[PDB]
Amino acid sequence: MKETPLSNCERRFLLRAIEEKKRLDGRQTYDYRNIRISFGTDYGCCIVELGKTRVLGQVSCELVSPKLNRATEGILFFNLELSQMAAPAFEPGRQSDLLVKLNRLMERCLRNSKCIDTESLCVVAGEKVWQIRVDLHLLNHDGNIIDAASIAAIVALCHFRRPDVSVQGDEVTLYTPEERDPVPLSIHHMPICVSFAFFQQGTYLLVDPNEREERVMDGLLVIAMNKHREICTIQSSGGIMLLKDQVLRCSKIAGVKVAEITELILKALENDQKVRKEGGKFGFAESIANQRITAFKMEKAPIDTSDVEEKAEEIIAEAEPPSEVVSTPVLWTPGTAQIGEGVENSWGDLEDS
Amino acid sequence: EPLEYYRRFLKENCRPDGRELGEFRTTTVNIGSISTADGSALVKLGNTTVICGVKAEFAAPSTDAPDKGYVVPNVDLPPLCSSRFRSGPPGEEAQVASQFIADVIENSQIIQKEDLCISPGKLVWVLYCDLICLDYDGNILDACTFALLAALKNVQLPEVTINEETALAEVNLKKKSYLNIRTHPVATSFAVFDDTLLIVDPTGEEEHLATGTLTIVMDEEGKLCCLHKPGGSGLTGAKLQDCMSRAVTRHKEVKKLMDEVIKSM
Amino acid sequence: CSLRHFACEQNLLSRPDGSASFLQGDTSVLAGVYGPAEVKVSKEIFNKATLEVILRPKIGLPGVAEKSRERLIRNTCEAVVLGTLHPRTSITVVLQVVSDAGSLLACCLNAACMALVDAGVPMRALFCGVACALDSDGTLVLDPTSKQEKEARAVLTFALDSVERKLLMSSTKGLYSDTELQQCLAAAQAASQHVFRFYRESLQRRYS
Amino acid sequence: VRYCIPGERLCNLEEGSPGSGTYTRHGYIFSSLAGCLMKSSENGALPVVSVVRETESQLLPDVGAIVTCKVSSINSRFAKVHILYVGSMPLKNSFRGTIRKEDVRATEKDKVEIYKSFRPGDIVLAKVISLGDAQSNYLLTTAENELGVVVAHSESGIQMVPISWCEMQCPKTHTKEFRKVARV
Amino acid sequence: LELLSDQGYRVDGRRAGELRKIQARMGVFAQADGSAYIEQGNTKALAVVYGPHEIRGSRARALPDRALVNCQYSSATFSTGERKRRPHGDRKSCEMGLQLRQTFEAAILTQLHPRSQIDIYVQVLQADGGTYAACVNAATLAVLDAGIPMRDFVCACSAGFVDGTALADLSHVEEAAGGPQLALALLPASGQIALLEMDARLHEDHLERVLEAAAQAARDVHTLLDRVVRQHVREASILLG
Amino acid sequence: TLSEAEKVYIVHGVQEDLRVDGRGCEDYRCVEVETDVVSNTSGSARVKLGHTDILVGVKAEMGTPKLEKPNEGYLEFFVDCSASATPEFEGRGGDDLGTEIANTLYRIFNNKSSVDLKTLCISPREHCWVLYVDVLLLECGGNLFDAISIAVKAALFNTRIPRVRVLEDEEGSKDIELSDDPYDCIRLSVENVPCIVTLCKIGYRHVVDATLQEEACSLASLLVSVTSKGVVTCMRKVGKGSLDPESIFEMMETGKRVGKVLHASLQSVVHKEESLGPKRQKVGFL
Amino acid sequence: GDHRRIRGPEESQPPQLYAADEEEAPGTRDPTRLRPVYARAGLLSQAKGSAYLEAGGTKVLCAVSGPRQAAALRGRLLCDFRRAPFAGRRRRAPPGGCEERELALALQEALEPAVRLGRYPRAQLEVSALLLEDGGSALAAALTAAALALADAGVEMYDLVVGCGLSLAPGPAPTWLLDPTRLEEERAAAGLTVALMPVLNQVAGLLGSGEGGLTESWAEAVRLGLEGCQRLYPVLQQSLVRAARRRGAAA
Amino acid sequence: ARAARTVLGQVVLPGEELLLPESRVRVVCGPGLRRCGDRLLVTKCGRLRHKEPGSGSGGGVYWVDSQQKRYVPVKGDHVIGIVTAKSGDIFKVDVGGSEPASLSYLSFEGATKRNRPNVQVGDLIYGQFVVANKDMEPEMVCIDSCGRANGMGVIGQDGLLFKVTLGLIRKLLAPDCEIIQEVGKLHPLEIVFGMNGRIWVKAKTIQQTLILANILEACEHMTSDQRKQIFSRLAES
Numbered sequence A: 001m002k003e004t005p006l007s008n009c010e011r012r013f014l015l016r017a018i019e020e021k022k023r024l025d026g027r028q029t030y031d032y033r034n035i036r037i038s039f040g041t042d043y044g045c046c047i048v049e050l051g052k053t054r055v056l057g058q059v060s061c062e063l064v065s066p067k068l069n070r071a072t073e074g075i076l077f078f079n080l081e082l083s084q085m086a087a088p089a090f091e092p093g094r095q096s097d098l099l100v101k102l103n104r105l106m107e108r109c110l111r112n113s114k115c116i117d118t119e120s121l122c123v124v125a126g127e128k129v130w131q132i133r134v135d136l137h138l139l140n141h142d143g144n145i146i147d148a149a150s151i152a153a154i155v156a157l158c159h160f161r162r163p164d165v166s167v168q169g170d171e172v173t174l175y176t177p178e179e180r181d182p183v184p185l186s187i188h189h190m191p192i193c194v195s196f197a198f199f200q201q202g203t204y205l206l207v208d209p210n211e212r213e214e215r216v217m218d219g220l221l222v223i224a225m226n227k228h229r230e231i232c233t234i235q236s237s238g239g240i241m242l243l244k245d246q247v248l249r250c251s252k253i254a255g256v257k258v259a260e261i262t263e264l265i266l267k268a269l270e271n272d273q274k275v276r277k278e279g280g281k282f283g284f285a286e287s288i289a290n291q292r293i294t295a296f297k298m299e300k301a302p303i304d305t306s307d308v309e310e311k312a313e314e315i316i317a318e319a320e321p322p323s324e325v326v327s328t329p330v331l332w333t334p335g336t337a338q339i340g341e342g343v344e345n346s347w348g349d350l351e352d353s
Numbered sequence B: 001e002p003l004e005y006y007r008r009f010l011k012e013n014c015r016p017d018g019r020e021l022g023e024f025r026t027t028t029v030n031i032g033s034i035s036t037a038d039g040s041a042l043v044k045l046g047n048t049t050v051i052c053g054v055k056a057e058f059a060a061p062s063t064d065a066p067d068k069g070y071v072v073p074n075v076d077l078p079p080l081c082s083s084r085f086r087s088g089p090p091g092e093e094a095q096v097a098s099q100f101i102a103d104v105i106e107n108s109q110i111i112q113k114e115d116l117c118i119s120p121g122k123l124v125w126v127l128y129c130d131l132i133c134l135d136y137d138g139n140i141l142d143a144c145t146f147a148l149l150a151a152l153k154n155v156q157l158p159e160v161t162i163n164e165e166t167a168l169a170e171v172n173l174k175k176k177s178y179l180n181i182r183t184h185p186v187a188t189s190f191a192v193f194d195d196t197l198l199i200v201d202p203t204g205e206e207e208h209l210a211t212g213t214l215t216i217v218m219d220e221e222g223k224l225c226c227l228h229k230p231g232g233s234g235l236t237g238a239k240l241q242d243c244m245s246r247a248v249t250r251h252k253e254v255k256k257l258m259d260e261v262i263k264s265m
Numbered sequence C: 001c002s003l004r005h006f007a008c009e010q011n012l013l014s015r016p017d018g019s020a021s022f023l024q025g026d027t028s029v030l031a032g033v034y035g036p037a038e039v040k041v042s043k044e045i046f047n048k049a050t051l052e053v054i055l056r057p058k059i060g061l062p063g064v065a066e067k068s069r070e071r072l073i074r075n076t077c078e079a080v081v082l083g084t085l086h087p088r089t090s091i092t093v094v095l096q097v098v099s100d101a102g103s104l105l106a107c108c109l110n111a112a113c114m115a116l117v118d119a120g121v122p123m124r125a126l127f128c129g130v131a132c133a134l135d136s137d138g139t140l141v142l143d144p145t146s147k148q149e150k151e152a153r154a155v156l157t158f159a160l161d162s163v164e165r166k167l168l169m170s171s172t173k174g175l176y177s178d179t180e181l182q183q184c185l186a187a188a189q190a191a192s193q194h195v196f197r198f199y200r201e202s203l204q205r206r207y208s
Numbered sequence D: 001v002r003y004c005i006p007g008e009r010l011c012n013l014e015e016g017s018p019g020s021g022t023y024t025r026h027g028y029i030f031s032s033l034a035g036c037l038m039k040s041s042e043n044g045a046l047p048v049v050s051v052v053r054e055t056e057s058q059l060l061p062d063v064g065a066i067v068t069c070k071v072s073s074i075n076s077r078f079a080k081v082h083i084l085y086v087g088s089m090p091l092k093n094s095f096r097g098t099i100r101k102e103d104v105r106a107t108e109k110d111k112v113e114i115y116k117s118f119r120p121g122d123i124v125l126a127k128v129i130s131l132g133d134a135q136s137n138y139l140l141t142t143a144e145n146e147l148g149v150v151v152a153h154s155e156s157g158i159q160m161v162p163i164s165w166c167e168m169q170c171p172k173t174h175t176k177e178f179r180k181v182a183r184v
Numbered sequence E: 001l002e003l004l005s006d007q008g009y010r011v012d013g014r015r016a017g018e019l020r021k022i023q024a025r026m027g028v029f030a031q032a033d034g035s036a037y038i039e040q041g042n043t044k045a046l047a048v049v050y051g052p053h054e055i056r057g058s059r060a061r062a063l064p065d066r067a068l069v070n071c072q073y074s075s076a077t078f079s080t081g082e083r084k085r086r087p088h089g090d091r092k093s094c095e096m097g098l099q100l101r102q103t104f105e106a107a108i109l110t111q112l113h114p115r116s117q118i119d120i121y122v123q124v125l126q127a128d129g130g131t132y133a134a135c136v137n138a139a140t141l142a143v144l145d146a147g148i149p150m151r152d153f154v155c156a157c158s159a160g161f162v163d164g165t166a167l168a169d170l171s172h173v174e175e176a177a178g179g180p181q182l183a184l185a186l187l188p189a190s191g192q193i194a195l196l197e198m199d200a201r202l203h204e205d206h207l208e209r210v211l212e213a214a215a216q217a218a219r220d221v222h223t224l225l226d227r228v229v230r231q232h233v234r235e236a237s238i239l240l241g
Numbered sequence F: 001t002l003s004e005a006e007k008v009y010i011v012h013g014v015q016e017d018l019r020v021d022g023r024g025c026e027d028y029r030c031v032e033v034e035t036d037v038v039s040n041t042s043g044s045a046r047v048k049l050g051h052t053d054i055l056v057g058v059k060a061e062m063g064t065p066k067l068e069k070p071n072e073g074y075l076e077f078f079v080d081c082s083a084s085a086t087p088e089f090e091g092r093g094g095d096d097l098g099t100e101i102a103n104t105l106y107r108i109f110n111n112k113s114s115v116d117l118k119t120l121c122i123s124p125r126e127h128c129w130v131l132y133v134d135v136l137l138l139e140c141g142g143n144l145f146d147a148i149s150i151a152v153k154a155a156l157f158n159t160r161i162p163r164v165r166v167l168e169d170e171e172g173s174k175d176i177e178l179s180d181d182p183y184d185c186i187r188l189s190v191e192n193v194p195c196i197v198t199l200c201k202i203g204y205r206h207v208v209d210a211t212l213q214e215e216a217c218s219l220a221s222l223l224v225s226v227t228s229k230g231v232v233t234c235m236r237k238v239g240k241g242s243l244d245p246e247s248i249f250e251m252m253e254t255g256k257r258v259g260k261v262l263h264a265s266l267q268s269v270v271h272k273e274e275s276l277g278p279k280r281q282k283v284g285f286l
Numbered sequence G: 001g002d003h004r005r006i007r008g009p010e011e012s013q014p015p016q017l018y019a020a021d022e023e024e025a026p027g028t029r030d031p032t033r034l035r036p037v038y039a040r041a042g043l044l045s046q047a048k049g050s051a052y053l054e055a056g057g058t059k060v061l062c063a064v065s066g067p068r069q070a071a072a073l074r075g076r077l078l079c080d081f082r083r084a085p086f087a088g089r090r091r092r093a094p095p096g097g098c099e100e101r102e103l104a105l106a107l108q109e110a111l112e113p114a115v116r117l118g119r120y121p122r123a124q125l126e127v128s129a130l131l132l133e134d135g136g137s138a139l140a141a142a143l144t145a146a147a148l149a150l151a152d153a154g155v156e157m158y159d160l161v162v163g164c165g166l167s168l169a170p171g172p173a174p175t176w177l178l179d180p181t182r183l184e185e186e187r188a189a190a191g192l193t194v195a196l197m198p199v200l201n202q203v204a205g206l207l208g209s210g211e212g213g214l215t216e217s218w219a220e221a222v223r224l225g226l227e228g229c230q231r232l233y234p235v236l237q238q239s240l241v242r243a244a245r246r247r248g249a250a251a
Numbered sequence H: 001a002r003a004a005r006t007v008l009g010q011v012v013l014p015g016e017e018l019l020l021p022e023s024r025v026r027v028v029c030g031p032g033l034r035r036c037g038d039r040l041l042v043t044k045c046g047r048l049r050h051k052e053p054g055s056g057s058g059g060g061v062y063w064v065d066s067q068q069k070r071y072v073p074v075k076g077d078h079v080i081g082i083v084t085a086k087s088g089d090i091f092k093v094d095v096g097g098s099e100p101a102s103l104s105y106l107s108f109e110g111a112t113k114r115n116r117p118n119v120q121v122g123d124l125i126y127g128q129f130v131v132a133n134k135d136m137e138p139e140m141v142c143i144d145s146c147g148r149a150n151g152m153g154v155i156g157q158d159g160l161l162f163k164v165t166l167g168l169i170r171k172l173l174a175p176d177c178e179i180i181q182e183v184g185k186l187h188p189l190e191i192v193f194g195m196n197g198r199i200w201v202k203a204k205t206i207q208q209t210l211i212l213a214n215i216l217e218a219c220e221h222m223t224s225d226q227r228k229q230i231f232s233r234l235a236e237s
Helices: A009-020 A099-112 A145-157 A211-215 A245-278 A308-317 B002-012 B092-108 B140-152 B204-209 B237-261 C064-077 C104-119 C146-151 C178-206 E091-107 E131-146 E204-239 F004-015 F095-109 F144-156 F212-216 F245-275 G098-111 G144-152 G217-231 G233-249 H166-172 H179-186 H206-216 H228-236
Strands: A035-039 A045-050 A053-060 A132-140 A195-199 A204-207 A219-226 A230-237 A295-298 A330-333 A336-339 B027-031 B039-044 B050-059 B071-076 B117-119 B123-133 B158-162 B169-176 B186-192 B198-200 B213-218 B224-228 C006-010 C018-024 C027-037 C050-056 C090-099 C127-134 C154-161 C167-174 D009-012 D022-025 D028-031 D036-040 D048-052 D066-074 D079-086 D123-128 D148-151 D167-169 D176-178 E024-026 E036-040 E047-053 E068-071 E117-124 E158-162 E165-168 F053-063 F074-081 F128-139 F195-202 F205-208 F220-226 F232-239 G037-041 G049-055 G058-068 G076-083 G124-133 G166-168 G176-178 G191-197 G202-209 H017-019 H033-036 H039-042 H046-050 H062-065 H078-083 H090-094 H101-104 H124-131 H139-141 H160-163 H192-194 H198-201
Touching: A009 A204, A009 A211, A009 H160, A009 H206, A035 A245, A045 A145, A053 A145, A099 A145, A099 A219, A099 A230, A099 E091, A132 A145, A145 A245, A204 A245, A219 A245, A230 E204, A245 E204, A295 C178, A308 B237, A308 C178, A336 B237, B002 B204, B027 B140, B027 B237, B039 B140, B050 B140, B071 B092, B092 B140, B092 B224, B092 C064, B092 C167, B117 B158, B123 B140, B140 B186, B140 B213, B140 B237, B186 B237, B198 B237, B213 B237, B224 C167, B224 C178, B237 C178, C006 C104, C006 C178, C018 C090, C018 C104, C027 C104, C050 C064, C064 C090, C064 C104, C064 C167, C090 C104, C104 C127, C104 C154, C104 C178, C127 C178, C154 C178, D022 D048, D079 D123, E024 E131, E024 E204, E036 E131, E047 E131, E068 E091, E091 E117, E091 E131, E117 E131, E131 E204, E158 E204, E165 E204, F004 F195, F004 F205, F004 F212, F053 F144, F074 F095, F095 F128, F095 F144, F095 F232, F095 G098, F128 F144, F144 F195, F144 F245, F195 F212, F195 F245, F205 F245, F220 F245, F232 G098, F245 G202, F245 G217, G037 G144, G037 G233, G049 G144, G058 G144, G076 G098, G098 G124, G098 G144, G098 G202, G124 G144, G144 G233, G166 G217, G176 G217, G191 G217, G202 G217, G217 G233, H033 H062, H078 H192, H101 H124, H101 H139, H160 H206, H166 H179, H166 H192, H179 H206, H179 H228, H198 H206
Parallel strands: B071 B123, C050 C090, E068 E117, F074 F128, G076 G124
Antiparallel strands: A035 A045, A045 A053, A053 A132, A195 A204, A195 A219, A219 A230, A295 C006, A330 A336, A336 B027, B027 B039, B039 B050, B050 B123, B117 B123, B158 B169, B186 B198, B186 B213, B213 B224, C006 C018, C018 C027, C027 C090, C127 C154, C154 C167, D009 D028, D022 D028, D036 D048, D066 D079, D066 D123, D123 D148, D167 D176, E024 E036, E047 E117, E158 E165, F053 F128, F195 F205, F195 F220, F220 F232, F232 G202, G037 G049, G049 G058, G058 G124, G166 G176, G166 G191, G191 G202, H017 H039, H033 H039, H046 H062, H078 H090, H078 H124, H090 H101, H124 H139, H160 H198, H192 H198
């Protein structure tokens, strides 16, 4: 199956809007759709919602032997993924020219910026070191997959907490959250992606576009830039043909937006740590809105486990015992034996000769 | 036509195979024919022929528990046994037929991985048991299990001794030991018709028209290892208790078969 | 024996036809369904629809195990969906594992059932998921946790109808005898009576 | 009686003529199958020697052949089918076909609405006319009095009966529907 | 290691704003519908294009409004010091063929060949320095050799930033040093940019100078390739008549 | 493909010792072999038999001996099939042909006396030289086997194998020490490297160096591997039709004679190119 | 590693490379003998045509599927060669191998000169061969069996295909041997396999590589291969006769 | 096993059974109900409803009404679709079901072999079905029963087309519905509903068309009185 086609009335209406500098959902040009984060119970797991998009991030680490060369660092996998349920079009092996540009954007940003400290993830050299592995999934496609994926990866990496080890002399030991407290990571900076869309041959631009606005646009400009004033990647793409003042304007815009987004992320992580430290209840369950028609909650229930013995006993007692015709095995010659109705002759011989 | 024709034999109480709706096909096995493998066995079940082969190699023990030797089963369905299988990567039917055997090998505890290590933390045995179906007529998971269990009763390994200064492995190919086998899990399969009829030892056409399937495997002490019910019409406790009464006789039959063929050497 | 905290939310995502997140305690599973749509000519069947079930884990990539547990879920939904009313079309079920804390297959079955109900698919009868885990001595525990699952000597999972409480799907781990198989089946039959009440109360609240 | 292997000396070109499933070279008649040695004496001497297995598991269709089919889906201008029987014998596999909106009736006429002619699920008797293109592969026809749907099926799973040249009626609910009835 | 001496000379001996030596060629192969060959410095590229033809496979994958550009990328297994053989499934080839398809879906004036394919192949025989710009220039020359109309003469060049200064036409030694590399694809007449890429960190104050230096180095590549095209067309015009 | 009347004209012409180009039943079109074209490798060749175009490269690298014999090296072939040769060679599709050629080359070179194996071992059971032969198809114009079996003998003749004098003594510097001389190497003694001879059959006559049109009119063909000395290494029959026993014996003689002339003339041309050295420049692809 | 199979150890060195029993001595024989062969046709029940060929230490099973949908005006002949992992000295990777593809092509380029595809327009035939045990010449068994299966599946052919095999002794006076075994094949220098049509007297396939470089030994290797293919014919003559006698009488 | 005429306006679940009045009657079961024996079975969630106009005759159909998005074509419905192709002499149009519909060049008003109508690819058409059984691709004609196109054909030149669920469409198409009158009191408007879950709107200002588009999708919920008047006043602005 494919996705519904685009009519010729919506295109005209969207372009009349864009000309008039008014958007569908009311938000003006330099705005984001507001954000809403939610944390799991075990560390390094979050659900970010930008507008109506969803991404699931989950970090996980493991101890391996560090290849050959680079004997004093650790490796860092990544794996974006697009879930068949995100949108009709996504198909497990039929959208192979978006996955590549997305994985590349994500990896170049996160791994070339050098914000994670992969220096201090060794135990010995030439021997076991930690191998982290980020994982993202797209749940609901409504445009701007990469801003949400980047914020998700950031939060998931800034909420993880490793295991921890004791090393002295030439001897290892591995603890557990009851034997020793999990340990945080070291994060230099916060690289946060921003996207721009261009409309009718660069004459207008719109920040943070959604999926209809994504189908009425010429090309896209992405500018990934960590906090302070330091750019980390740019990738023009789509169908665009650019000037030189516009890249600078865009860089300013991305500066502002990454400032605001980092503000938000820091505040949310702080609130989450405060909640976890007070001693209250946390998790995916205690996030479900209760003021809403589509939610229902039920505490525990002993059902009545008073009768199962009797029923099982009568059932076992009330049925026919195994019968008693026992079969015999036949021996032809050591190596082959037969059981069943058998064959008339011992074996065939000169049947046709 | 399809449904009504078969029920004519069902009401007649004699299905077109010539069976009383509660009896199994003819079963025969051979052991010790392929001389390029550690152990092998051929199982014939009135068609549905399956052959298995075992190869033993050396491997490094795992990082968590360095006292265990791996055992890896695999079931392959070539496009020559039937006409619906196509060439390429393994299909859904072979993957399920392999996960089922892996679960049986794990849950049944037929072998203990601590009996395969040579020197803890350095070297452990690894067993490669590969099953290839030569003809697909029906009841695949019964003959695959019987082929594996029959093969595992013939594999014999040579005595390996590791030096101290040399620290290498010297294989004594003259004195060859045996394998320690604990239990004997034997499976039995039932095919359920539209809502109430259950038959034993089905056929590919019957599985093509049936609406469900159930498999139960038993030990030598009346203990269930797995209860494979992929889904379908629905059953009750009385029907399951009827099935296990037949499975007890089937298990006694098969265990007498294995206890007799091995005795003949 | 006591089922733990239950919660459910419906119509989360705007793109699919019906969505339903079902979390029972700490573990959670999200699901969505696309209604009867076009199907590839090489896979279509006349006088019937075609069910497609794919399962995605949270860490790693799906292997033999996830397809072996995908067959069970597809062959369980196939017995309660009236496909004959919609031939030459396709019905697809997608399951995403968000968090795992024990008894994942039962929560997946409940997520699939609530997604099919929300999507508006003709159904013959509802189905449930109940998991039993008897300990090393014989003390039955219902809806266990991976802490108890690790110690337990046998874990069993059942899918039960909503009409006469029959048995639809059965996947078992560990070795046991038939007597406690009967007593855990009876415990499952006793447990489904509360899940179906949770179903009815949730849909009664939805149409308030 | 004697059987064959797909090559041997059988007869001279003067001592008979090649038949079905045979080839000749260098003045001799050579076998090309593993069937049975059949010599159709017919009338006029010089029997047309041929070899036939007489146990046909599969057989390729021809330019003209009678086949029993089964409709899969119907369209406003064609109707895809599945070849099921080659004349009488059962077929191990299933081929594909297509009846264009010119082969329904024996006149190649206008009108002839496809919707009420070949409703899916029926079993029809038809004849091929060609080896077809890559889109439609066999190009079957029913342009005859003896060809058309032979054994239909009711809306709710009841054996149907012919009622006229164009109309059939249900025995249970007495409902009227349109088909293309072939002579029995 | 010194990448810029106090005198101002680089490792290989050229100044900041100095290019390597290029030596191109048009019409290398006979069977194909176009060809080219360029050696930018010590990097040897190659490009072969095939004219608008019938769509292969005929699987109803056509566009009723324009043509279908299909670009590939490959690399010889002896293109660098180590063997480093790769299968034909790598995502480096896929991303290079996607940036090539992106820039040639914008440079070529494609709305004149409805329901047609254009197959472009690029082969790198020795990689030392900027591979993207060498492939773009070799395929621009191959497209000109094939006679396909296009809006302008697209040319690409890279740049860098070391010690508060902007470099030009970086080499492998300078590239593998963790610096803010940057590449364009420019249309000289309009000044428009067809593709922009970046990696590693860079402050916001120095983006204007690196981008300007890259655009200027691309305009310097334009003149050198322009004299090659003019000499080739005057050669064939003299031959014809 | 070509029509039936064209195939009839061609098969009739071959039987009359006339061909569309004008040569005879045994003539062989000229080639433009060359050496030392690629920089990063340690030996190169470029054979142009017509519309075809070949380019190969040999690189010698350090490695470990195999288990069966410790005093030996090994050879590694990889016949790439570039997609620029044909649009139908796009991505996947050139894999079967490349594997077929690589396996044929392995069968050609799988012998004890192919070139040598003692010279590529330096320390028994611990080190050895490895050779990577990398063929790269640039264009296809028929007779692809011989245009590669010639560029392999040519490239093998131009190897360097820089000499290493490192002592293996534990007390000494066991780690491989080179000669530190950037221009100190050693030849390879490729005198008896075999080559392939193809013999297409049309009608009842066999033709050497058949073109694509003349190949499409043939039903079978035979390959013979002959060295300069005149010995056979591999013999594989490829085609879709029978051949008959007699044609094996009458094709073996033509394989012998064409092999002898090919080897003698190749030795002469390589010696002529080598007699004058750094002069004469090097021209290729420009 | 593989996401469609059961994953075990990442690396596994077989004990043959650690086998402390030194390689034995094959022995000597008469080079004018053939291993006795038993052939059976029509084995499988779900296959259109099948045959099982066994001689000495070789066990090969071949099955032929019927014509299916999809040089037309002619039908294709797909081929597939695959050998059981529990065959030979060591294990083999299930996914495949270049040697298997080489033998598949040596089968396709040898069975097409026999069948007449000008009778199955737009159709195709699929042939599958499996080697249960490798105890000698293999390509001399994947040809005889895959030719018996085709004739037993009711397809029209010009003639059969009978294969043979040879190997060269490593002594100072080498001599070609007929029907070599693994003890006489791993110690050899060269090998040759011929595919002869016994009635049409036309060679169908040829393959040979090794250390024999004089163009007077290969003439003998070829002509003793032809004598072998002319001596294996009667057994295959009575096998299809028995197969058709039994198949026909079952009606 | 409850009985009908007693559980009207009550939420039911799949698998439940109910008893119609006693004397088997020929009342036809609706979308979410199937008749088995002398009982009815429920296959869809929703709420039981029974509709007999005015008299003691039949006069009466049993049908549950639920909330869903996927649309199944029903014969005699006014469905808005979007053209996709122009193959042959027909007009394939996407309505939202499993298969595309099919127009004809002469189905429009006053169309012949010469004066064919101008229909492009990617345009929205207002038209009703005439064949919608589950045996063929649905087919729709586009003028009238008599032959005078009453607003049908290709519509939409300066409006916005959005998509809503089937529940809001069912709610709006009621004879006792005051949604449109009050919503049009604030902003003058003109609507063309479609039973496949699509709505075409055209206000005066583009801002008003955006506001009406957003605020109409929420009128299925947010019950009237205590909520709707205050909600209208807040959005008045």
